[PDB]
Write a protein that binds this ligand. Sequence first.
Ligand code: CA
Ligand code: CA
Ligand code: TB
Length: 650
Amino acid sequence: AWTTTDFPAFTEEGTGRFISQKVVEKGTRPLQLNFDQQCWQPSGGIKLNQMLSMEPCRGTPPQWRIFRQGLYTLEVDTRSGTPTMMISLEERQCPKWDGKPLTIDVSKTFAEGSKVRDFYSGNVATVSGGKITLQPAFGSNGLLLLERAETAAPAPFDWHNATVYFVLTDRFVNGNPANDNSYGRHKDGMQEIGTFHGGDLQGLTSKLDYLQQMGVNALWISSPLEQIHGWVGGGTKGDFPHYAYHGYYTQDWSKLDANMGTEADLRRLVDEAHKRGIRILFDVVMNHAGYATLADMQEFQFGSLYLQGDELKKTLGERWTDWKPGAGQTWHSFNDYINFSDKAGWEKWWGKKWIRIDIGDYDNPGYDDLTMSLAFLPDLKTESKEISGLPNFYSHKPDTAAKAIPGYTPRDYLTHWLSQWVRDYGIDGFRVDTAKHVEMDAWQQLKTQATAALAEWKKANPDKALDAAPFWMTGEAWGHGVMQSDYYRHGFDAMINFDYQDQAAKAATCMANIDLTWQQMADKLQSFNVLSYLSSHDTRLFREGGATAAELLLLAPGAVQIFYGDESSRPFGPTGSDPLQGTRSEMNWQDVNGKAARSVTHWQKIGQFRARHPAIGMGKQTTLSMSRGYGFVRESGEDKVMVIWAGQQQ
Ligand SMILES: [Ca+2]
Ligand SMILES: [Ca+2]
Ligand SMILES: [Tb+3]
């Protein structure tokens, strides 16, 4: 019932939002939205990709200026009470689409006389002569998501149909600003490339409904465990202070990092998530501890400085971590104050039984994946059989839950420390970092202990547990593809798939180009699982897919990983002299309620569809042969879907 001249009637794309699309030639035209006899118009000028205020129609209608030809989207939002609206433009051996309805042969898929729903539109059609006719809705990108109209709700969770949301908690939602500066951490007052922005568990807990609406059923959070308190030089040029905002620079595995919140905050995160049918994954590290920082050296009384006497307080200050680089220095310059050769000083850190590192009197790193010091990080001796006792510097850390345990090796402590979280909070699985730099046996020990820990909790908490499924574990082995490697026989249920990113890239301008990849994956993954992604914190943000990134990821066989902000085209941020930093940019919440709202809606719909159909993640694929457009069927057990893509609208 929303309309404007020379554009189709608006359809609802999300509650309270209505949109319309058309290919429009260059030129100028008036702009009024009508809803019956209500007439509205832009009151504050006309720009693209901005929330336009609107007034009741008076005088001459505002003149909208069409600079470039293309498919435009008009949106109107009634959620605020008064109508706002928005305009946006979507700037070959590829199937073309005239824009008009499609007639699909469904004779081998859906029963004669039955009802078939296109989930995206909600339109339902009765199979007659083995055929249905349907118009792809606005925002579909020409998709039909065909299911039996009987389909009503989400299907039972399966890890092979999982929609995993991977979030860097610090960069998501700041629920409580009070804990932003734990252990004397500061903002840099520059571009905050490597600082703690202040995102926390409380904040994340506040967005569980939003995640639930996307059809997310697994939440992978950055490690919430206590990190190094200080910072190191950021990037190749030391143009920013690098803090452990990502969770990969752990110091105490036994405690939560104060930036993240309290024990109660975690309990609420996990319990609320479970209530919504969302599983929880901790990012975990056993390869390395965090770098030595001034904050930690001072606090826990380890390491060695070249500065002696009055020179120490006058250069580094009362709190050494408050040091900032002066003229002619970088954030790497502080290293010149540190004496990394002093044996006694640096033994007071982790200690010779715990880590490998080219410092002091430590065991030197090896020249292979397993024993090397990855980017100069202290390499934990997971393969050691030596009884170690606690790390030396823990003697000056009275707030630790870590107790010395008779007979324990460094590995035994680590697996105990991680499993305790599983035991206490009912963490459903892990994502394992740096998988190829730790021996397979260690991962097996982690899995065994974690499996036991989860089973113990579910038995203790029968009210809370969703099912009796076993602990799950995925891993990052660098460059891993769609292959059932030996990781699968040392405790990994799935490995992260590095190859999907490039395949999706080749289908960014033409969705149908993914067909061969999807066929191969659907077949290969009949006997195992992988976790595929478009975007990651150590590759890039995938933004070349126009509006089609949702379907490219979410219709993939196997488990899939949404990197926070994929749904809202979160932009690459300031990155300085480390090319990876921009991928950890702040979540663009302002865009989520504004210019990215229809994108978010698009992801919600395609994700909700996947959640209803295990055949997407698990089923065997048959690619349809048609004269127009592209289409396939997938089938797993009683579940069956048909996906049709009309093709390019221009
Ligand atoms: Ca905070
Ligand atoms: Ca190692
Ligand atoms: Tb190796």
